[PDB]
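Forwarding the complex inputs:
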Amino acid sequence: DFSEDSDSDIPEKFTPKTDLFDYTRREEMIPMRDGVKLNTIILIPKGVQNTPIVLTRTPYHAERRTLRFNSSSLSMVVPQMNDTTSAARYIIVYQDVRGKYGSEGGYMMNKPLTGPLNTTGTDHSTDTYDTIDWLVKNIPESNGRVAAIGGSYEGYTTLMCTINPHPALKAVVPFASMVDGWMGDDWFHMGAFRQEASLPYAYNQEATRKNEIKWWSGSYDTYDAYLRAGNAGAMAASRGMESIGFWKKLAAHPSYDSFWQQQAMDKMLAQHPLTVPMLIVGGLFDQEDIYGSPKLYKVLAPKDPEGKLVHFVLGPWNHGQGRRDARSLGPLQFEGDTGGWFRRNVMQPFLDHYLKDAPKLDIPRVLSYETGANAWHRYDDWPPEHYCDLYVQEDGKLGFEMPAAKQAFDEYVSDPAKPVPYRQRPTIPSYAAESTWGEWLVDDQRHTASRTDVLVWATEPLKEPLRVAGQPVARLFASTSGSDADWVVKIIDVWPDEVPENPKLGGYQQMLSADIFRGRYREDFAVAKPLVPDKVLEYRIPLPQVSHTFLPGHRIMVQVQSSWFPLYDRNPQTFVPNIMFAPPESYRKATQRVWRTAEYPTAIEIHIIS
Amino acid sequence: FSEDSDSDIPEKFTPKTDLFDYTRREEMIPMRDGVKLNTIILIPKGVQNTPIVLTRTPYHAERRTLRFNSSSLSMVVPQMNDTTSAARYIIVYQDVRGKYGSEGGYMMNKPLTGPLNTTGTDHSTDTYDTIDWLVKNIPESNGRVAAIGGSYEGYTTLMCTINPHPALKAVVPFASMVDGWMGDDWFHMGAFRQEASLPYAYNQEATRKNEIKWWSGSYDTYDAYLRAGNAGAMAASRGMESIGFWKKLAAHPSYDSFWQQQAMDKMLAQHPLTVPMLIVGGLFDQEDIYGSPKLYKVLAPKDPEGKLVHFVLGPWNHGQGRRDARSLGPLQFEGDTGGWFRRNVMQPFLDHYLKDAPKLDIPRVLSYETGANAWHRYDDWPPEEAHYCDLYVQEDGKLGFEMPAAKQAFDEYVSDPAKPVPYRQRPTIPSYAAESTWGEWLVDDQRHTASRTDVLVWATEPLKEPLRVAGQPVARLFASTSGSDADWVVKIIDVWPDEVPENPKLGGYQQMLSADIFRGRYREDFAVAKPLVPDKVLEYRIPLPQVSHTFLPGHRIMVQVQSSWFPLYDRNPQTFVPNIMFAPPESYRKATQRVWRTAEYPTAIEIHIIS
Amino acid sequence: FSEDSDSDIPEKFTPKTDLFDYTRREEMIPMRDGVKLNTIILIPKGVQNTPIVLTRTPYHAERRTLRFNSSSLSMVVPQMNDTTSAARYIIVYQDVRGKYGSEGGYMMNKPLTGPLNTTGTDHSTDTYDTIDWLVKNIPESNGRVAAIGGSYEGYTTLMCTINPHPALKAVVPFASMVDGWMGDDWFHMGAFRQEASLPYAYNQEATRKNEIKWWSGSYDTYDAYLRAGNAGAMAASRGMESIGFWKKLAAHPSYDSFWQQQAMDKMLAQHPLTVPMLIVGGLFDQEDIYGSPKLYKVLAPKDPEGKLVHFVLGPWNHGQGRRDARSLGPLQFEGDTGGWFRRNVMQPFLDHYLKDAPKLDIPRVLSYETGANAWHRYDDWPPEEAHYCDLYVQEDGKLGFEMPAAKQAFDEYVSDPAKPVPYRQRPTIPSYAAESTWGEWLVDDQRHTASRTDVLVWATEPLKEPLRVAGQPVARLFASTSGSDADWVVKIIDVWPDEVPENPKLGGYQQMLSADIFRGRYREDFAVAKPLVPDKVLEYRIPLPQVSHTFLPGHRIMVQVQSSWFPLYDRNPQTFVPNIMFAPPESYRKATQRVWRTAEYPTAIEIHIIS
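Prediction (whole assembly, three chains):
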C-alpha cells in the first residue's frame, strides 16, 4: 500500500515488537479517589503466576527508571536496586508521583499528609492506598501482596506507604530516606543552607512537569558563580525562580519553624502506629541524607521493643551505593561488593518471608559495617552496649587529658570574601558527567589543614587499634567577634606516613564524620538569635554516625573552620533577619576562637568499644 | 501563593535570559504548502548588519543549538560553528520537514520533486522559503546567508544550491551523504551496511521525535547479527515492516532507478553551478568516504577556472572536520588540523562572500598528507612530478612492481559464512554506544586478520626511501570462487617498522589506510544482480578510498584480501539468491577462494605515486 | 660442558651484535694528568667520513646510550639524538671526571682552573683531551665534532667552548645550568630549593656509581620537610655532613665570591666567542628557567653580526626541548614543537658546520608564542611596534594600567611559617618518583592558593581584544612586613574564560605563566644578607621568567603574591637569622605583610607589550 514517492516513512502509530522479551510492560493511568490519574508502569515477568509486587513511587520519570538499558531482558531494564526482586521474578512497579512527568495533578515538593500543610484532600499515603487497591484487583499474575522499596525521595514515598497502610502492604525497604531536610538531610544541616543541593534541584524538578526546562550555567567552577551572586536569593533571582514553589517555601522558612517541624518524618512516624515491617538501610558516607536513616531507627526502635518490625542496616555506602555495587568508595576499599551482598543476603530473604511465606532469616536489630576493620557486625542496639571525651589541646594536640588551663584558645580569622572551598576547585554540580560528588565525604582534608582560616588537632600515631561506634557529639566552646557564625567540625582518620598496601595513600587525611552548625540557632532552632560578640558560647553539634577502627599507625584528627563553600551559603558573620537575602555590607571578617580550658573544655564525645 | 494547596510548578515558566550574550528566537516558519518548520535563530547581543549561517538537520535543532546548557553563545553551538560564533554571525538551525519540532511527513533524504517526490515540495523549496523569511524578518542581518553542515546536514547544504535563493552567497558541505549505495552510508558497491542502516532507520523513523529507540538483547553485535542470519530477520525481529526506509532498502538491493536518480554527484552535475562551494572531506571518514571526492570530480569540470568549487581533504574521521582533530587513534597529526581549517580557510571563505572581506587565495585542492603531516596546495585531485603504476600481488606473501610470469599461480583460502571475519576485534558494539570507538575504526591495527587462514596477505620489504601516494587507488582483482556469489574486501595498509622510537607501542602496527568491499553479484552491472560462474577466474574493478600519504623508510606497503566484514556488512551467502536481505539459512555455504597472479590474470593495486 | 657439575654461567660472555646496525666502542681515554674517562662511542654501520656528536654527562653514559635494550641505534640513543642517529652521525657519551665509569675526583659543576679549582684540570681541558683522542682514533670520523646536551649536559656543552679544540665546529646547549644561585637549580634570588638540592647531592655524591640512594620515611614531602624545620636538619637526618656540595651550599647561602665566579653567563662574557652556539631554552623550564635567556643577553653583543649565537625559546618544560612536545599539562601546542625544532632547526645547523651542507637562515631569536601557538622570527629578545608598560595592582582585587593616586592604600595578609603555602596541591612527591608530574608544575592551576587568606589576588576584567606580551616581566614590589625577613612570591597568571568551548573542564583555570620568589634579606645586595625594617615600605625589583604569550579575548591577567612556596623552597623564618639553613625553631614567627598601591609606592608588573 505504501507509496515510495509521496508517503511519510514514519507510520501513524508505532508499537515496538516485544514478544521475544521475558517481561510484559503494562502502562496504566490509575485514577485516585479525587479523579486525578497517576502514570503507573507495571513490569510482569513472563512464565509466572501468583508473584508478589515490589512498588516504587518516584518524582524522577517512571518510564526512564524502568529503562536502565533499552533491553529485551527484565534484569537489564530495572535499576540495580531491583536486581534481587527481578531475579525472584517479582512484579516490578514504578509510578510517577502526583504532578510529575506522566501523572496528572499539581506537584508539592515532599507533599506532607493531609492537615495544616496539606488542604488538597489527598497525600502520598492516600495515593498509595488507591494504587495498591487497583494493582491487587487488576493484575491477575499477582499473589495480592505488595512491598514498597526506594531510596532518597523514593525512600520518603516508601515511608508514606506505612501511614494508614493498605492490607496488601506486607513490608517496606526505605534506603537513605529524606526524613528532615532542615535538621541535616538535603536542604539544610542544622540551619546552614545547601544552596548548591537545593537551587538547581528545585529549578529542574519544578520549572515544568516533565523537566523540559533545565538549570543553565555561565561558569564551569560553581565556587566562582555562587560567590559572585553574594547570597542564595540573588542566585535564585538570576534564574528567575521567584515563581518556583519550593524556593518560595525555602525563602519564607529559613528557621526550623512550624513548616519544617510538622514535616519531620521521624517525628511524624513516631506519632503513628507501626504495623508494617521496616528494613532501614543507611550509608556511613551518604553525601545527601546522612541524618535520615539513623534518626529513623532511634525513634521507631522503642515502638518495637523486641524486634518483630524495625531493622536497621548501616553500610559503608555513599548516597546510592546501598542500591548498587559497593566494592570501594574513592581510595577506600571494602571486602567485596557490600551493596550486592546486602540485597542478596538480607533484603531478598526479608522480602520473600513477608511476601512469599519463605523461612524467616534471623536478621539482627542493627547490622553495621565497621570501616578500617572491614567487617559486618550483628548488634542489639545503635550504639552497641563506653562514652569518652577527646579534648582539643595545646600545640595542635588531641587527647583524653582534660585541660587544666585558665585562659587557653586557638585563634583564626574567617573571611567571607574568601570562603573555604568544601572540595578542591574547580567545584562542579553533582549531576555533571565527571562529578565525584558521591566520593566527597571521604575526601583528603590536607588542602584545608595548611590553611590559616582552619584549625587542626591530631593525636600521636596509635600503637593499638581504636574502635568507635554510634554518634560523635562535638562539645564546642567558641567565641566570634561578629554577631553570627557557621561552625564546621570534621573527624578525620589520618593514614600512616607510609602505606605498604597502597603507597600513594601516605599521609592521606581521610574525612570520616563531619557536619556544620549555623550559630544563630544555638539557643532555639525555630528562632534566629544573634550571637554576643567576643563572648564564649557552648555549641552541641551531633556529627554523622561512625563505625570505624582507627588502625595502628593512624591518627585521629579534628578540623574546625567557619565556611564550606559553595555547597553551603556563606554566613555573613553579622546578624541579619534572613541570610538568603543578606546585603553585601553584612559580610565581614571575624576573629574566631576555639577555647580549651577547665571551664570551657572543647572536645568530641565518642563511644569507644572493646 | 498558598503553601498548603497550590502547585509548586507554575503554569508557564520562562527562563531568565537577559544576562545571556545572545538572543534565542524560536519560529515556526510556514512553507509554500502551509506546513511549518521549527527554526532556531541565535542572534548575538548588540550585533547589526551580520550574515546568517544556516544548518538544516533531522537531529533535533533545539538540541543541536544546546551543546551545553549555557548563557554563552560559544558554548551552545556545535564546534562546527566556533569560527562563525566568534565572528558574531547569526546561527540558525532548522528541523527538516517531518522531524522533531517540524510539521509534515518525513521522507529519508527527501529527493527533488519528480519521479521519486510527488508531494510538491523538497529540501530546496523548503530552503528557499526559509531563507526568504529569515532575510525579511531578522533585522540584525545584512541579508546574506551561507549553508554549512556535515553528513545529512551536508546533504541538506547541497540541496540549498538547487534553484538557490538570491541571498545564498556560499556553501560548506562537510562529509555529505552523496550516494548511499555506491559507497556512503547504506551500501558499499552493493554490500549492505546492516549495522549502520537498521538501528538508524528505526530511531529516526519509528516516531517523529525519536521517542521509540532500538532495543538490544546482546552486548556483542557480531553474535546478535549472526544469530539473525540475514538483515531481513534482524529488521523483522524489531517489527520494522511499517518503517518506510527499510521498505525502500529491502525493495531496492541493487543500484536500480531508485538509487541512480538520488545520486547527488549525478544530480548536481545536471543543474547549474552558481553558488561558491567548499567541499570538506575526510581521509578516514567511517560513514561517507565516497561523497566528497566524487562531488569535486563531477563539479570541477563545470568550473574550469576554479571560481566556485574548492576541495579540502583532511586527516579526519566522519566528524573531525567539524571539531578538534589533533589525533585519530594511535595516529598523531601536526596540531589541531580541524580547528586550523575552520579558522584559516573556512572563516575567510565565508567572510569574503558574506562581509566583502579580502578574498583569500584558497587552492583548487587542499590536501593533508599523512606520514609527512603537511598541507599541500594542489591544482587538481590527484596532483598532475607524478606517475600512475601497478602494485602486483606475488608468491611467498610478497608485493612488488615486478609483473607476474605466465605459469599458473594463485593464493587460496576458504571463506566460511558460519565464521565471518569480524571487521573489528570483538566485542563489536553500535556506533552510538557510550564507549564506542567507531570513529577510529578505519585506522585499526589489521594484525588480528593477518594471522587468519581465511584472509590473504601480501607485503613489500621495508622501504629504504619514502614512497608518496595520492588520489584514488583501484584494485584490479582477478579472483575465482567455488560458489555462485562472493564479497571481496581489499585493504591497503601501512605496516609501521619493527621498532618505533617515537612511540614504541606502535612497533609492527598494521595501520589500515584505504579499504573497501565489493558485492560480487554486481560485477558486470551495478543495477542487475548476476551469479558468478563457479571456479572461473573473473576480473573485478574495486576503486578504494582516497589516499594522500607518505610510506616512510622502514615501513611496508600491505594488501589484505578477505570475503567478509561482519557485523557492519551482512554476510554474502556465497550461493546466488535473488535478495541477500532474505537469504535462507541453506544458502550460506563454504567456498574456496583464489586470488590469481599470472601474466593473463595480474591482480594488482593501481596507485598514483608522486615525486 | 658437564651438566652435573659445571656452572651454567660462562666465565666470559659477549652479546651477539653482528645483526645490529651500529658498533658500540667503549674506551678509557687518558687525560693530560693520567686520569682515564669512560667514553662510549656508537658508530653506525656502513658509513665513513661522518661527524661526531659528543655529550659529557654525570648521569651514567652506559645507561644514557641504552634508552631501550635494542639492535637499532635509533632505539638506544636519547630522543635528543633522534636527528643525529637518522643522519648516521657517530654518537659519543662520556662519563664526566669522578662519575660512574670514570676515574678521578668529583666536583659538582667543576669550574675552570682558577681560585675555585687548583687541580690543574677542568671540563674544558678534559674535553680538549677527549676530542683530540676521538679525531685521531676513530677512522669512520670526518674529523669534525659538535657538542650537544641539556641541563648538566648543557653545562658541559658550554665548557667545550672555552679554549676549544680545532675540531669543535658547533654546540647545542639545552636548558643549561648557568647560575645555580640567581635562578637555576639550587636557589632563586636567595630562596633555597631544598627539595631540588639535597636528594640530588645525596644520590650523585654519596658514591661514584650512585650505589646508595636517598631513603624516605614519608610519602608527602610537605610534612617531611616541615617536621625537619630547616634544610640543615633535613641534610643532617640523612648524614650528609661529609657530602661536598652540601658543605658548599651550607657555607655559601648568599651570592658571595663562590657563586659569582661560577656564573656561566659572567664567565662566557669574559672569554672569546668562536664556536657557533644554538641556545635552546624553554618557557616552562621547572629546573633551569634563568640560564638560557641570560646566555643570549650577555653573548648577543659579542656577536653583533649574528654569525655565531642563536636563541631558541620553545613552549617546553625542562626536558621537552630534547623530546616530543605536543602538550604540557592541560596546554596543547600546534604539533610536536620539540621534534619540529630538532628536525628543521638543530639538524640543518649541525649539518652546515659539520658536513658543509647549505646554511639555513636561522633567525637571531626563534620564539614560540603561547596562546597564539606560533613560531616567530625575531631580531632580538625582547623584539624591538613595542613599548614598556606598568600593570599596577589596584583596590578591590583589580589590576590595570591606571597609576594609583591614593596616599594610604595597601592589601594586607598574615604569613604563618607554621602553615606554609604548598607550592602544589598535596601530597607533594619527589621529582624522580614514577607518578611525578614535576615537569608540568609551572602551568599548575593557581585556584588552590587564590582562595587562601595568606595569599593576595589581583586580576583584570576579561579582555575584549588580544594582549601580546614578550620578554622579561619585572615585578616592582612595594611591600612591608612586621618581621625582619621575608620571601616574596610573585605570580603572573592567565585566567582562562569562565567557560571554555574547546575544553569545558578548563573553565576558570588560573594557568601560571611566569612566577618567581625573592629572598628579602638580599633586597639591596645579593652578596650580603641584611635584615628588613619592620613595618617599613621597602622597594623590591624581582625579574620574572620570560614570556611569549597572547592573552586571548575572554581571558584575564592575574597577579598573586604570597610569602612561602613549600616544600620546594625552605621557609623564610620571617625574623632575621645569620643562616636560614640552620634557623632555630623559635625564629619562625607569624608576620603581617602589606603590598602598597599609592602614588609614592605604586606596586606594578613592568611588561613589554607588542602589536
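Chain C touches chain A at residues 216-220, 222-224, 414, 416, 419-422, 425-427, 435, 445, 447-448, 451-454, 498-500, 504-509 (CB under 8 Å).
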